[PDB]
């Protein structure tokens, strides 16, 4: 996976703003799973 430390915070923040209540760590894990495709990560977490 891509290391957490290299994920731009803007991608985490985009997910956070939609997924009120979700932690950064859940979002980071999903972004790593989806190759930083934030749209796919947020869809995955919504479903």
């Amino acid at each position: 996976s891509i290391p957490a430390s290299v994920i731009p915070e803007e991608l985490i923040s985009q997910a956070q703003v939609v997924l009120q209540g979700k932690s950064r760590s859940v979002i980071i894990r999903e972004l790593q799973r989806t190759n930083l495709d934030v749209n796919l990560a947020v869809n995955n977490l919504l479903s």
């Binding site: 985009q14 703003v17 939609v18 009120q20 749209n39 947020v42 869809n43």
Partner: protein, 72 residues
């Protein structure tokens, strides 16, 4: 009643709606304005996905409330 619909990248879509509008009605207004099929839209308010047949009333959506649009 003006509301805002923010896309995932933080772009604002300003809409004029009524509290009695269903979520499906709101998706059709987004289709009209933005060209996005209702069947591809997920609308989120305070972290929860909104149900197509339920009105804005059922979510206490008010003037200047912000929804989030995610495409599926």
């Amino acid at each position: 009643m003006q509301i805002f619909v923010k896309t995932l990248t933080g772009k604002t879509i300003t809409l004029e709606v009524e509290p009695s509008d269903t979520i499906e009605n709101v998706k059709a207004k987004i289709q009209d304005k933005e060209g996005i099929p209702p069947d591809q839209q997920r609308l989120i308010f305070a972290g929860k996905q909104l149900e197509d047949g339920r009105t804005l009333s059922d979510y206490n959506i008010q003037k200047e409330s912000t929804l989030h649009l995610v495409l599926r």
